[PDB]
PDB file of all heavy atoms in Angstrom:
ATOM      1  N   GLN A   1     -69.816  76.590 -31.701  1.00  0.00           N
ATOM      2  CA  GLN A   1     -70.991  76.812 -32.524  1.00  0.00           C
ATOM      3  C   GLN A   1     -71.733  75.497 -32.761  1.00  0.00           C
ATOM      4  O   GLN A   1     -71.126  74.423 -32.767  1.00  0.00           O
ATOM      5  CB  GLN A   1     -70.596  77.429 -33.864  1.00  0.00           C
ATOM      6  CG  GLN A   1     -69.933  78.790 -33.756  1.00  0.00           C
ATOM      7  CD  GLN A   1     -69.333  79.246 -35.070  1.00  0.00           C
ATOM      8  OE1 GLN A   1     -68.721  78.459 -35.793  1.00  0.00           O
ATOM      9  NE2 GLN A   1     -69.508  80.523 -35.390  1.00  0.00           N
ATOM     10  N   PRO A   2     -73.054  75.554 -32.956  1.00  0.00           N
ATOM     11  CA  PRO A   2     -73.798  74.323 -33.264  1.00  0.00           C
ATOM     12  C   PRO A   2     -73.486  73.756 -34.637  1.00  0.00           C
ATOM     13  O   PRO A   2     -73.769  72.576 -34.878  1.00  0.00           O
ATOM     14  CB  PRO A   2     -75.263  74.763 -33.159  1.00  0.00           C
ATOM     15  CG  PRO A   2     -75.230  76.221 -33.472  1.00  0.00           C
ATOM     16  CD  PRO A   2     -73.939  76.731 -32.889  1.00  0.00           C
ATOM     17  N   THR A   3     -72.916  74.550 -35.540  1.00  0.00           N
ATOM     18  CA  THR A   3     -72.551  74.089 -36.872  1.00  0.00           C
ATOM     19  C   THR A   3     -71.101  73.631 -36.959  1.00  0.00           C
ATOM     20  O   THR A   3     -70.587  73.446 -38.067  1.00  0.00           O
ATOM     21  CB  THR A   3     -72.805  75.194 -37.901  1.00  0.00           C
ATOM     22  OG1 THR A   3     -71.957  76.314 -37.622  1.00  0.00           O
ATOM     23  CG2 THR A   3     -74.259  75.639 -37.854  1.00  0.00           C
ATOM     24  N   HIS A   4     -70.434  73.445 -35.823  1.00  0.00           N
ATOM     25  CA  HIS A   4     -69.052  72.990 -35.828  1.00  0.00           C
ATOM     26  C   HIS A   4     -69.000  71.482 -36.069  1.00  0.00           C
ATOM     27  O   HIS A   4     -69.843  70.743 -35.555  1.00  0.00           O
ATOM     28  CB  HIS A   4     -68.371  73.333 -34.504  1.00  0.00           C
ATOM     29  CG  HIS A   4     -66.877  73.264 -34.555  1.00  0.00           C
ATOM     30  ND1 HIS A   4     -66.183  72.075 -34.493  1.00  0.00           N
ATOM     31  CD2 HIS A   4     -65.943  74.239 -34.662  1.00  0.00           C
ATOM     32  CE1 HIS A   4     -64.886  72.320 -34.560  1.00  0.00           C
ATOM     33  NE2 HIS A   4     -64.714  73.625 -34.663  1.00  0.00           N
ATOM     34  N   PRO A   5     -68.031  71.004 -36.857  1.00  0.00           N
ATOM     35  CA  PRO A   5     -67.959  69.555 -37.122  1.00  0.00           C
ATOM     36  C   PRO A   5     -67.772  68.716 -35.869  1.00  0.00           C
ATOM     37  O   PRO A   5     -68.365  67.636 -35.760  1.00  0.00           O
ATOM     38  CB  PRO A   5     -66.759  69.438 -38.072  1.00  0.00           C
ATOM     39  CG  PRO A   5     -66.669  70.777 -38.730  1.00  0.00           C
ATOM     40  CD  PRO A   5     -67.075  71.766 -37.678  1.00  0.00           C
ATOM     41  N   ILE A   6     -66.961  69.181 -34.917  1.00  0.00           N
ATOM     42  CA  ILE A   6     -66.757  68.422 -33.687  1.00  0.00           C
ATOM     43  C   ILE A   6     -68.026  68.420 -32.844  1.00  0.00           C
ATOM     44  O   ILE A   6     -68.344  67.428 -32.176  1.00  0.00           O
ATOM     45  CB  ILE A   6     -65.552  68.985 -32.910  1.00  0.00           C
ATOM     46  CG1 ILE A   6     -64.301  68.974 -33.791  1.00  0.00           C
ATOM     47  CG2 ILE A   6     -65.307  68.181 -31.643  1.00  0.00           C
ATOM     48  CD1 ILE A   6     -63.064  69.507 -33.102  1.00  0.00           C
ATOM     49  N   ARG A   7     -68.775  69.525 -32.864  1.00  0.00           N
ATOM     50  CA  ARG A   7     -70.034  69.587 -32.128  1.00  0.00           C
ATOM     51  C   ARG A   7     -71.058  68.617 -32.706  1.00  0.00           C
ATOM     52  O   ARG A   7     -71.703  67.864 -31.967  1.00  0.00           O
ATOM     53  CB  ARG A   7     -70.576  71.017 -32.142  1.00  0.00           C
ATOM     54  CG  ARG A   7     -72.029  71.146 -31.705  1.00  0.00           C
ATOM     55  CD  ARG A   7     -72.154  71.268 -30.194  1.00  0.00           C
ATOM     56  NE  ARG A   7     -73.479  71.729 -29.790  1.00  0.00           N
ATOM     57  CZ  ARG A   7     -73.831  73.007 -29.703  1.00  0.00           C
ATOM     58  NH1 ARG A   7     -72.954  73.960 -29.990  1.00  0.00           N
ATOM     59  NH2 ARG A   7     -75.059  73.336 -29.326  1.00  0.00           N
ATOM     60  N   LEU A   8     -71.218  68.620 -34.031  1.00  0.00           N
ATOM     61  CA  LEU A   8     -72.187  67.731 -34.662  1.00  0.00           C
ATOM     62  C   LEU A   8     -71.744  66.276 -34.575  1.00  0.00           C
ATOM     63  O   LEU A   8     -72.570  65.384 -34.349  1.00  0.00           O
ATOM     64  CB  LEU A   8     -72.401  68.145 -36.117  1.00  0.00           C
ATOM     65  CG  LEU A   8     -73.011  69.531 -36.322  1.00  0.00           C
ATOM     66  CD1 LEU A   8     -72.881  69.958 -37.771  1.00  0.00           C
ATOM     67  CD2 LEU A   8     -74.469  69.536 -35.890  1.00  0.00           C
ATOM     68  N   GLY A   9     -70.447  66.018 -34.754  1.00  0.00           N
ATOM     69  CA  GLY A   9     -69.948  64.660 -34.625  1.00  0.00           C
ATOM     70  C   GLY A   9     -70.116  64.098 -33.228  1.00  0.00           C
ATOM     71  O   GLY A   9     -70.348  62.898 -33.061  1.00  0.00           O
ATOM     72  N   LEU A  10     -70.000  64.951 -32.208  1.00  0.00           N
ATOM     73  CA  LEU A  10     -70.218  64.503 -30.837  1.00  0.00           C
ATOM     74  C   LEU A  10     -71.671  64.107 -30.618  1.00  0.00           C
ATOM     75  O   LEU A  10     -71.958  63.057 -30.031  1.00  0.00           O
ATOM     76  CB  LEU A  10     -69.804  65.599 -29.855  1.00  0.00           C
ATOM     77  CG  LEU A  10     -70.237  65.405 -28.400  1.00  0.00           C
ATOM     78  CD1 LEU A  10     -69.513  64.228 -27.761  1.00  0.00           C
ATOM     79  CD2 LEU A  10     -70.008  66.679 -27.607  1.00  0.00           C
ATOM     80  N   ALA A  11     -72.605  64.937 -31.089  1.00  0.00           N
ATOM     81  CA  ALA A  11     -74.021  64.624 -30.929  1.00  0.00           C
ATOM     82  C   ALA A  11     -74.429  63.415 -31.759  1.00  0.00           C
ATOM     83  O   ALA A  11     -75.385  62.716 -31.405  1.00  0.00           O
ATOM     84  CB  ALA A  11     -74.871  65.836 -31.302  1.00  0.00           C
ATOM     85  N   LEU A  12     -73.725  63.154 -32.862  1.00  0.00           N
ATOM     86  CA  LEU A  12     -74.043  61.990 -33.682  1.00  0.00           C
ATOM     87  C   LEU A  12     -73.686  60.696 -32.960  1.00  0.00           C
ATOM     88  O   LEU A  12     -74.531  59.808 -32.804  1.00  0.00           O
ATOM     89  CB  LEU A  12     -73.316  62.079 -35.025  1.00  0.00           C
ATOM     90  CG  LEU A  12     -73.558  60.927 -36.001  1.00  0.00           C
ATOM     91  CD1 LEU A  12     -75.042  60.766 -36.283  1.00  0.00           C
ATOM     92  CD2 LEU A  12     -72.788  61.150 -37.293  1.00  0.00           C
ATOM     93  N   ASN A  13     -72.435  60.576 -32.505  1.00  0.00           N
ATOM     94  CA  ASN A  13     -72.014  59.362 -31.814  1.00  0.00           C
ATOM     95  C   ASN A  13     -72.689  59.222 -30.455  1.00  0.00           C
ATOM     96  O   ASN A  13     -72.852  58.101 -29.960  1.00  0.00           O
ATOM     97  CB  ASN A  13     -70.494  59.347 -31.657  1.00  0.00           C
ATOM     98  CG  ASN A  13     -69.773  59.251 -32.988  1.00  0.00           C
ATOM     99  OD1 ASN A  13     -70.338  59.561 -34.036  1.00  0.00           O
ATOM    100  ND2 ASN A  13     -68.517  58.821 -32.952  1.00  0.00           N
ATOM    101  N   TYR A  14     -73.081  60.339 -29.838  1.00  0.00           N
ATOM    102  CA  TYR A  14     -73.821  60.268 -28.582  1.00  0.00           C
ATOM    103  C   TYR A  14     -75.195  59.646 -28.799  1.00  0.00           C
ATOM    104  O   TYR A  14     -75.623  58.776 -28.032  1.00  0.00           O
ATOM    105  CB  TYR A  14     -73.944  61.666 -27.970  1.00  0.00           C
ATOM    106  CG  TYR A  14     -74.199  61.693 -26.476  1.00  0.00           C
ATOM    107  CD1 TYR A  14     -74.159  62.890 -25.771  1.00  0.00           C
ATOM    108  CD2 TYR A  14     -74.481  60.530 -25.771  1.00  0.00           C
ATOM    109  CE1 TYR A  14     -74.392  62.927 -24.409  1.00  0.00           C
ATOM    110  CE2 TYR A  14     -74.716  60.557 -24.409  1.00  0.00           C
ATOM    111  CZ  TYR A  14     -74.669  61.758 -23.733  1.00  0.00           C
ATOM    112  OH  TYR A  14     -74.901  61.790 -22.378  1.00  0.00           O
ATOM    113  N   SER A  15     -75.900  60.080 -29.848  1.00  0.00           N
ATOM    114  CA  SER A  15     -77.184  59.471 -30.176  1.00  0.00           C
ATOM    115  C   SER A  15     -77.024  58.002 -30.544  1.00  0.00           C
ATOM    116  O   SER A  15     -77.908  57.189 -30.252  1.00  0.00           O
ATOM    117  CB  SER A  15     -77.854  60.239 -31.316  1.00  0.00           C
ATOM    118  OG  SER A  15     -76.991  60.349 -32.435  1.00  0.00           O
ATOM    119  N   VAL A  16     -75.909  57.646 -31.184  1.00  0.00           N
ATOM    120  CA  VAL A  16     -75.635  56.243 -31.475  1.00  0.00           C
ATOM    121  C   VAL A  16     -75.437  55.461 -30.182  1.00  0.00           C
ATOM    122  O   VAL A  16     -75.917  54.329 -30.043  1.00  0.00           O
ATOM    123  CB  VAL A  16     -74.417  56.122 -32.409  1.00  0.00           C
ATOM    124  CG1 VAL A  16     -74.002  54.670 -32.567  1.00  0.00           C
ATOM    125  CG2 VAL A  16     -74.732  56.734 -33.765  1.00  0.00           C
ATOM    126  N   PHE A  17     -74.737  56.054 -29.210  1.00  0.00           N
ATOM    127  CA  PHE A  17     -74.548  55.389 -27.925  1.00  0.00           C
ATOM    128  C   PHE A  17     -75.859  55.252 -27.163  1.00  0.00           C
ATOM    129  O   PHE A  17     -76.033  54.296 -26.399  1.00  0.00           O
ATOM    130  CB  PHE A  17     -73.524  56.149 -27.083  1.00  0.00           C
ATOM    131  N   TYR A  18     -76.787  56.191 -27.349  1.00  0.00           N
ATOM    132  CA  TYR A  18     -78.077  56.096 -26.677  1.00  0.00           C
ATOM    133  C   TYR A  18     -79.002  55.093 -27.355  1.00  0.00           C
ATOM    134  O   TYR A  18     -79.898  54.545 -26.703  1.00  0.00           O
ATOM    135  CB  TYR A  18     -78.745  57.472 -26.622  1.00  0.00           C
ATOM    136  N   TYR A  19     -78.800  54.836 -28.647  1.00  0.00           N
ATOM    137  CA  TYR A  19     -79.671  53.946 -29.404  1.00  0.00           C
ATOM    138  C   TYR A  19     -79.168  52.505 -29.409  1.00  0.00           C
ATOM    139  O   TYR A  19     -79.909  51.586 -29.045  1.00  0.00           O
ATOM    140  CB  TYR A  19     -79.819  54.459 -30.841  1.00  0.00           C
ATOM    141  CG  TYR A  19     -80.838  53.704 -31.666  1.00  0.00           C
ATOM    142  CD1 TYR A  19     -82.181  54.056 -31.638  1.00  0.00           C
ATOM    143  CD2 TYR A  19     -80.456  52.645 -32.481  1.00  0.00           C
ATOM    144  CE1 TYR A  19     -83.117  53.371 -32.391  1.00  0.00           C
ATOM    145  CE2 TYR A  19     -81.384  51.954 -33.238  1.00  0.00           C
ATOM    146  CZ  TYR A  19     -82.713  52.322 -33.189  1.00  0.00           C
ATOM    147  OH  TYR A  19     -83.640  51.638 -33.941  1.00  0.00           O
ATOM    148  N   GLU A  20     -77.916  52.292 -29.817  1.00  0.00           N
ATOM    149  CA  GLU A  20     -77.411  50.931 -29.971  1.00  0.00           C
ATOM    150  C   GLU A  20     -77.026  50.309 -28.634  1.00  0.00           C
ATOM    151  O   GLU A  20     -77.200  49.101 -28.439  1.00  0.00           O
ATOM    152  CB  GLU A  20     -76.213  50.919 -30.922  1.00  0.00           C
ATOM    153  CG  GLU A  20     -76.486  51.543 -32.281  1.00  0.00           C
ATOM    154  CD  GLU A  20     -75.382  51.261 -33.282  1.00  0.00           C
ATOM    155  OE1 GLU A  20     -74.199  51.472 -32.942  1.00  0.00           O
ATOM    156  OE2 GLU A  20     -75.697  50.818 -34.407  1.00  0.00           O
ATOM    157  N   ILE A  21     -76.505  51.109 -27.705  1.00  0.00           N
ATOM    158  CA  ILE A  21     -76.003  50.583 -26.440  1.00  0.00           C
ATOM    159  C   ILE A  21     -77.108  50.582 -25.390  1.00  0.00           C
ATOM    160  O   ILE A  21     -77.465  49.529 -24.851  1.00  0.00           O
ATOM    161  CB  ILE A  21     -74.783  51.385 -25.951  1.00  0.00           C
ATOM    162  CG1 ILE A  21     -73.646  51.303 -26.971  1.00  0.00           C
ATOM    163  CG2 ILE A  21     -74.323  50.881 -24.592  1.00  0.00           C
ATOM    164  CD1 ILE A  21     -73.153  49.896 -27.226  1.00  0.00           C
ATOM    165  N   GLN A  22     -77.658  51.760 -25.094  1.00  0.00           N
ATOM    166  CA  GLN A  22     -78.626  51.893 -24.013  1.00  0.00           C
ATOM    167  C   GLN A  22     -80.047  51.522 -24.421  1.00  0.00           C
ATOM    168  O   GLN A  22     -80.924  51.481 -23.551  1.00  0.00           O
ATOM    169  CB  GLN A  22     -78.607  53.324 -23.467  1.00  0.00           C
ATOM    170  CG  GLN A  22     -77.250  53.794 -22.944  1.00  0.00           C
ATOM    171  CD  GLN A  22     -76.890  53.216 -21.582  1.00  0.00           C
ATOM    172  OE1 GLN A  22     -77.151  52.048 -21.292  1.00  0.00           O
ATOM    173  NE2 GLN A  22     -76.283  54.043 -20.737  1.00  0.00           N
ATOM    174  N   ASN A  23     -80.290  51.248 -25.706  1.00  0.00           N
ATOM    175  CA  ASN A  23     -81.621  50.888 -26.203  1.00  0.00           C
ATOM    176  C   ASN A  23     -82.654  51.952 -25.839  1.00  0.00           C
ATOM    177  O   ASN A  23     -83.799  51.650 -25.492  1.00  0.00           O
ATOM    178  CB  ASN A  23     -82.050  49.510 -25.690  1.00  0.00           C
ATOM    179  CG  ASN A  23     -81.116  48.402 -26.141  1.00  0.00           C
ATOM    180  OD1 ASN A  23     -80.145  48.077 -25.458  1.00  0.00           O
ATOM    181  ND2 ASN A  23     -81.409  47.813 -27.296  1.00  0.00           N
ATOM    182  N   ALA A  24     -82.241  53.218 -25.920  1.00  0.00           N
ATOM    183  CA  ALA A  24     -83.096  54.362 -25.615  1.00  0.00           C
ATOM    184  C   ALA A  24     -83.350  55.148 -26.894  1.00  0.00           C
ATOM    185  O   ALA A  24     -82.637  56.120 -27.184  1.00  0.00           O
ATOM    186  CB  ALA A  24     -82.452  55.252 -24.548  1.00  0.00           C
ATOM    187  N   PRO A  25     -84.349  54.774 -27.698  1.00  0.00           N
ATOM    188  CA  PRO A  25     -84.584  55.510 -28.949  1.00  0.00           C
ATOM    189  C   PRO A  25     -85.125  56.910 -28.728  1.00  0.00           C
ATOM    190  O   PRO A  25     -84.845  57.802 -29.538  1.00  0.00           O
ATOM    191  CB  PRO A  25     -85.590  54.622 -29.693  1.00  0.00           C
ATOM    192  CG  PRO A  25     -86.312  53.897 -28.611  1.00  0.00           C
ATOM    193  CD  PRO A  25     -85.298  53.661 -27.522  1.00  0.00           C
ATOM    194  N   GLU A  26     -85.891  57.132 -27.657  1.00  0.00           N
ATOM    195  CA  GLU A  26     -86.428  58.465 -27.401  1.00  0.00           C
ATOM    196  C   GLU A  26     -85.318  59.451 -27.060  1.00  0.00           C
ATOM    197  O   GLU A  26     -85.352  60.608 -27.497  1.00  0.00           O
ATOM    198  CB  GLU A  26     -87.464  58.405 -26.279  1.00  0.00           C
ATOM    199  N   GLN A  27     -84.324  59.013 -26.283  1.00  0.00           N
ATOM    200  CA  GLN A  27     -83.210  59.891 -25.946  1.00  0.00           C
ATOM    201  C   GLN A  27     -82.333  60.178 -27.158  1.00  0.00           C
ATOM    202  O   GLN A  27     -81.796  61.284 -27.284  1.00  0.00           O
ATOM    203  CB  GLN A  27     -82.378  59.277 -24.820  1.00  0.00           C
ATOM    204  N   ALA A  28     -82.177  59.203 -28.056  1.00  0.00           N
ATOM    205  CA  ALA A  28     -81.343  59.416 -29.234  1.00  0.00           C
ATOM    206  C   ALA A  28     -82.032  60.325 -30.244  1.00  0.00           C
ATOM    207  O   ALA A  28     -81.388  61.192 -30.845  1.00  0.00           O
ATOM    208  CB  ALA A  28     -80.985  58.075 -29.871  1.00  0.00           C
ATOM    209  N   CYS A  29     -83.339  60.138 -30.448  1.00  0.00           N
ATOM    210  CA  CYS A  29     -84.063  60.964 -31.410  1.00  0.00           C
ATOM    211  C   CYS A  29     -84.116  62.419 -30.964  1.00  0.00           C
ATOM    212  O   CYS A  29     -83.963  63.331 -31.785  1.00  0.00           O
ATOM    213  CB  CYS A  29     -85.474  60.416 -31.616  1.00  0.00           C
ATOM    214  SG  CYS A  29     -85.550  58.848 -32.510  1.00  0.00           S
ATOM    215  N   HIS A  30     -84.335  62.657 -29.669  1.00  0.00           N
ATOM    216  CA  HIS A  30     -84.403  64.028 -29.173  1.00  0.00           C
ATOM    217  C   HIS A  30     -83.045  64.714 -29.256  1.00  0.00           C
ATOM    218  O   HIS A  30     -82.958  65.883 -29.648  1.00  0.00           O
ATOM    219  CB  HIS A  30     -84.927  64.041 -27.737  1.00  0.00           C
ATOM    220  CG  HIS A  30     -85.138  65.416 -27.183  1.00  0.00           C
ATOM    221  ND1 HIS A  30     -84.143  66.122 -26.542  1.00  0.00           N
ATOM    222  CD2 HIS A  30     -86.231  66.216 -27.176  1.00  0.00           C
ATOM    223  CE1 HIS A  30     -84.614  67.297 -26.163  1.00  0.00           C
ATOM    224  NE2 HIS A  30     -85.878  67.379 -26.536  1.00  0.00           N
ATOM    225  N   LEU A  31     -81.974  64.004 -28.892  1.00  0.00           N
ATOM    226  CA  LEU A  31     -80.642  64.600 -28.937  1.00  0.00           C
ATOM    227  C   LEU A  31     -80.206  64.877 -30.370  1.00  0.00           C
ATOM    228  O   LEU A  31     -79.598  65.918 -30.649  1.00  0.00           O
ATOM    229  CB  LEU A  31     -79.637  63.686 -28.236  1.00  0.00           C
ATOM    230  CG  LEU A  31     -78.161  64.073 -28.346  1.00  0.00           C
ATOM    231  CD1 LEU A  31     -77.920  65.466 -27.784  1.00  0.00           C
ATOM    232  CD2 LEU A  31     -77.292  63.050 -27.638  1.00  0.00           C
ATOM    233  N   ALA A  32     -80.504  63.959 -31.292  1.00  0.00           N
ATOM    234  CA  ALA A  32     -80.121  64.164 -32.685  1.00  0.00           C
ATOM    235  C   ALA A  32     -80.890  65.323 -33.306  1.00  0.00           C
ATOM    236  O   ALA A  32     -80.311  66.141 -34.031  1.00  0.00           O
ATOM    237  CB  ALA A  32     -80.343  62.881 -33.485  1.00  0.00           C
ATOM    238  N   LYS A  33     -82.194  65.414 -33.032  1.00  0.00           N
ATOM    239  CA  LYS A  33     -82.990  66.500 -33.593  1.00  0.00           C
ATOM    240  C   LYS A  33     -82.650  67.838 -32.948  1.00  0.00           C
ATOM    241  O   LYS A  33     -82.784  68.885 -33.591  1.00  0.00           O
ATOM    242  CB  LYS A  33     -84.480  66.196 -33.439  1.00  0.00           C
ATOM    243  CG  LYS A  33     -85.381  67.030 -34.338  1.00  0.00           C
ATOM    244  CD  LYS A  33     -86.840  66.628 -34.191  1.00  0.00           C
ATOM    245  CE  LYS A  33     -87.706  67.297 -35.247  1.00  0.00           C
ATOM    246  NZ  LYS A  33     -87.595  68.781 -35.199  1.00  0.00           N
ATOM    247  N   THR A  34     -82.212  67.826 -31.687  1.00  0.00           N
ATOM    248  CA  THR A  34     -81.835  69.071 -31.023  1.00  0.00           C
ATOM    249  C   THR A  34     -80.595  69.678 -31.667  1.00  0.00           C
ATOM    250  O   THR A  34     -80.573  70.870 -31.994  1.00  0.00           O
ATOM    251  CB  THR A  34     -81.600  68.825 -29.532  1.00  0.00           C
ATOM    252  OG1 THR A  34     -82.779  68.257 -28.948  1.00  0.00           O
ATOM    253  CG2 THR A  34     -81.269  70.131 -28.824  1.00  0.00           C
ATOM    254  N   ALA A  35     -79.549  68.870 -31.858  1.00  0.00           N
ATOM    255  CA  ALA A  35     -78.347  69.366 -32.518  1.00  0.00           C
ATOM    256  C   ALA A  35     -78.593  69.650 -33.993  1.00  0.00           C
ATOM    257  O   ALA A  35     -77.915  70.501 -34.580  1.00  0.00           O
ATOM    258  CB  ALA A  35     -77.205  68.365 -32.354  1.00  0.00           C
ATOM    259  N   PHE A  36     -79.550  68.951 -34.606  1.00  0.00           N
ATOM    260  CA  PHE A  36     -79.892  69.224 -35.998  1.00  0.00           C
ATOM    261  C   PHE A  36     -80.573  70.581 -36.135  1.00  0.00           C
ATOM    262  O   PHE A  36     -80.172  71.407 -36.963  1.00  0.00           O
ATOM    263  CB  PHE A  36     -80.784  68.109 -36.545  1.00  0.00           C
ATOM    264  CG  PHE A  36     -81.122  68.258 -38.002  1.00  0.00           C
ATOM    265  CD1 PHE A  36     -80.227  67.854 -38.979  1.00  0.00           C
ATOM    266  CD2 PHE A  36     -82.338  68.794 -38.394  1.00  0.00           C
ATOM    267  CE1 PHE A  36     -80.536  67.988 -40.320  1.00  0.00           C
ATOM    268  CE2 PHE A  36     -82.652  68.930 -39.733  1.00  0.00           C
ATOM    269  CZ  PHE A  36     -81.750  68.525 -40.697  1.00  0.00           C
TER     270      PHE A  36
END
C-alpha cells in the first residue's frame, strides 16, 4: 500500500539520495510528491 511505513520510508530516503548525492532536486521533488 502507498500508506505503508516501509513504502513511505523507502521513497523518503530515495528522494534524499537523489537530492544530497546526485544533486538532482527535480527528481527528488517529483518522487517525494508522488509518494505523498
Side-chain angles (χ1 to χ4, degrees), residues 1-16 19-25 28-36:
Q1 298 169 318
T3 64
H4 197 281
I6 304 180
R7 166 86 165 274
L8 296 167
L10 168 68
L12 180 57
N13 294 20
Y14 202 172
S15 54
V16 172
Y19 187 86
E20 305 192 311
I21 299 299
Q22 302 284 39
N23 299 90
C29 290
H30 185 272
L31 172 59
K33 197 177 189 303
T34 303
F36 184 81

